[PDB]
Amino acid sequence: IDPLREELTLESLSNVKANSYSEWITQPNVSRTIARELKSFLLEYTDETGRSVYGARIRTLGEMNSESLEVNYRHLAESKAILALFLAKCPEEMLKIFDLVAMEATELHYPDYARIHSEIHVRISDFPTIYSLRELRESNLSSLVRVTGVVTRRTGVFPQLKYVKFNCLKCGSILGPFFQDSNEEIRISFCTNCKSKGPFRVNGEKTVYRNYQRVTLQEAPGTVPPGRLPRHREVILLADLVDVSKPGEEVEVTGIYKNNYDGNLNAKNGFPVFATIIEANSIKRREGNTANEGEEGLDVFSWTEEEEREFRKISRDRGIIDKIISSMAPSIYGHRDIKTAVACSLFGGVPKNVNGKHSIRGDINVLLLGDPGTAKSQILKYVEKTAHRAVFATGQGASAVGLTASVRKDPITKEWTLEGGALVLADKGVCLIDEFDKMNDQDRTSIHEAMEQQSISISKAGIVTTLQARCSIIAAANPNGGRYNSTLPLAQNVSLTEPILSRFDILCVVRDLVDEEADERLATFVVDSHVRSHPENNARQRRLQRQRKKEEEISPIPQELLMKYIHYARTKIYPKLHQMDMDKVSRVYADLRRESISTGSFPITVRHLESILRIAESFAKMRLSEFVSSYDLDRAIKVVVDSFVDAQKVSVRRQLRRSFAIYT
Amino acid sequence: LFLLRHSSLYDSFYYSNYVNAKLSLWNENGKKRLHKMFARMGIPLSTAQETWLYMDHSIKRELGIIFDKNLDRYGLQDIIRDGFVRTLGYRGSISASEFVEALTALLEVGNSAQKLTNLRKRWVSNFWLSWDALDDRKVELLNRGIQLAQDLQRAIFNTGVAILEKKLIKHLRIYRLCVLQDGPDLDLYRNPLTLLRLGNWLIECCAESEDKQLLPMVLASIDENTDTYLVAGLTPRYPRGLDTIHTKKPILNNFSMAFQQITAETDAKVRIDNFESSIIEIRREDLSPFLEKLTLSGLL
Ligand SMILES: Nc1ncnc2c1ncn2[C@@H]1O[C@H](COP(=O)(O)OP(=O)(O)O)[C@@H](O)[C@H]1O
Ligand SMILES: [Mg+2]
Ligand SMILES: [Zn+2]
16 A cells, blocks of 8 residues: 555544644645545535535535635534644645645536636635734734724736746756745745756746735724724735725735745844735625624625525515515614615615616615604614615715715825725615715715716816716705704705705605603613613524524514525516506606695605606515516505605695595 | 527527526526536536637537537437538538528518508518528628527517516416517517417427426417407427327317307407418407307317
8 A cells, every 4th residue: 555645534633743733734644634524524514404505505606607615614613623723723735725625526516617717715704713903913923814904005906927937047947837925926046957046037838827916904993992003914815806805995804924024124123023914815894794793604695595595485475575664673663664765775776778878776865854862873773784885974074075986196106096985885785874964065965966877977187087876875864953843844844955855765754742652652662672682681503592582572584684685686686667557657746746836845856756666666676576566566656655745734734645545 | 509600608598498498597596507507517607608609619619528418417408409501611600490590580570451551561571681681692681680580589588588477377278378468579579470489489488398288378469559469379389309109199270260160150350361370360359258269169
């Protein structure tokens, strides 16, 4: 038997006989044992359900033509503790072996996958320990670390030489290709054959290129101590990792802590100090996901095939829309009109492009004009948590170019450049503007183009460009005087102008009135919620079970399942209108215009007919239906008419409600 | 496959009646299955969507072997067939099926009683475009016909998706029924040939499969410019490429006799002027009584 082909066992693998972990892993027999154990873990691991998680993951990976297999660290730790320890201590060689064993499990399912992607990368999802850029020390060198920060700066994607080939200047012999480290340059000093002190011209008949990118990771403002300067690190993103993190975002970086010799560093400091970097292994978008940190996986909004089947099963239910509405902010007692609007905005409409000449917005904007203590900021926070991409801004905390896009001079290239804003960051998402009425006029006026054209136009310092802002806006405002005056028209209760008001699809007026029954019910619900949330009131499985039991009381649908459902519906569902009552909608629009002719009333234009259609599309989308039904159109008509009626005065509200009773 | 040599491989598999029937490409599951099949064949998605001429030559040469080893897994073993391919010096090669598809597309979309006469005059005019396409000097007409065929197949696929998602195909014991009333492309289906194309698409999909007893299908469309129907009876088809004694025997189209008998007995001003006796024109109001009598006749 060839000794190089013999293998040890797991308990013998635990016992280390080398001077270092890397030397132990690199040994032939140990490497074979590790590869065999990793393959066994990938093939045989089962979850609580009992199905192979990684088999389905590999199937999905092959279906989408991707080159990254996500492996949860906890699964490996429970299944194989020693392998998890090796991965934590020696990420490099362990990751190499893991990558090899993954293209043999992918190839197991798709035999000819090598013709699509040559190699497959393994990405670690949930490293148990999280560090700050301040906490990094020398003891973390050459070991896997998990850090969080802000992407301050970014480079363009460059092709980097995977393998470097050298040829002697003198002799002319061409040395074999050598592995290019991501961190620092590879050079040949001593020639095997020539033995020449002289340098080698670097030449190669054929070279394989690799995607390369570098970012400047900075401590997030939230985590840095107040009033202290942030610390930063340089993160290197290799192939398949490029462009995943965009400047200004908050991310969690899983990578290898590496050091290298820097001459200028030494020169400047006067001590033998080594530069440090991070080799990114995995990136998780933490932006707007502070309250979602309790979940697992690189993306909490992604779904599996079984979850898709569950989504279909849920959608087939008749009362899906009612459950979805009831599940919006379960801790808020009532306001079933502010929950319906929020759900409609979250799901959104279908943008349309007629013959390539006419562009129609497909997003829904909502405005909350109400009393001081009617749970508006909490609703905005919930929307931020649930939405896939959300941005939160305050009244005076937002500038006219902090929203939209701004122009700066690039520190490196000394040239004018373009930066994104709130709107940009909220592309295909939601922008939340609390304290809308306290906004500066200038600031307010900025969003006019963005809210309808879904685009940002910039003409500054020789920069002539148009961006994409396909973001919905939900805003909370306080009526003039600090309290709504139901006697006066809507226009006199707020300082907003006709265009901005017209740009809002749904208006939700919130009134605080003293009523014995309403006060009793609201107080009872608030007290019950406060008692429910008291901190005092397997171990992980037990915690999840008790959390699920607590959630079941107030929400018919799990919150995480709800977020996944919303993301799936937005991504994969585009309803269309083919059968609909033209006369009904036309008459509703005409009646709305006739009733809105009154001075000081809520503005009505074609925008609101389009908003009726958009809300019908959104209601159809809530059921994962490919076609808008008559019921959805009726519901949208009822919503719009109810909002319009509620926006009126006390004196004429009864007459308006009696007149419009047919549609509602 | 639909126009393999003048479109992409992905489009060829996507817009084929047989592939859609055997995979149900009208929903997300079918698309996922097709993507999985393409991934196991070793063809990248970007490569598959590349046009036929510029597709990587290695994959094009290996296509025969790749199909030989992978199509059986997904039940598409019938895609393998022998056809006639004609080539001219330094020109592209076109198969007989693609030529027929181009000719039919030119015939279909090439470009009260008065409107009917004008429509039939337009069809007579399209006949001459189809005739001209048969010449070797007029190749631009053939390319235009190929493009129109692609567009028409796309439209028919959309209409079929709409029909199947809405579950518009009512099932009666004697026969199936499907009526179009508020589609997006109702105008295209005034031509009998386009209606027959849609009927064949629907017959192969979810009916030839599913192990359901063969039943003749009724397909009807509506045009608002004249306020009348175009009813077309369609004979059932056995599973494709399944040699059997019962498959050897043919299935006759009995709808002409039943339609004639109903028209003679009833009073609805029906038109049986078309050469294909199974295709008739029915007034808007009379379709419900006509279908009642058809169900009660039992001669289908
Ligand atoms: N309908 C309600 N149900 C439950 N809690 C409520 C409700 N209305 C108000 N609250 C409570 O009162 C507080 C209202 O503060 P907040 O809504 O942030 O002020 P604003 O309405 O000015 O944004 C919240 O902490 C919330 O818990
Ligand atoms: Mg507030
Ligand atoms: Zn040499």
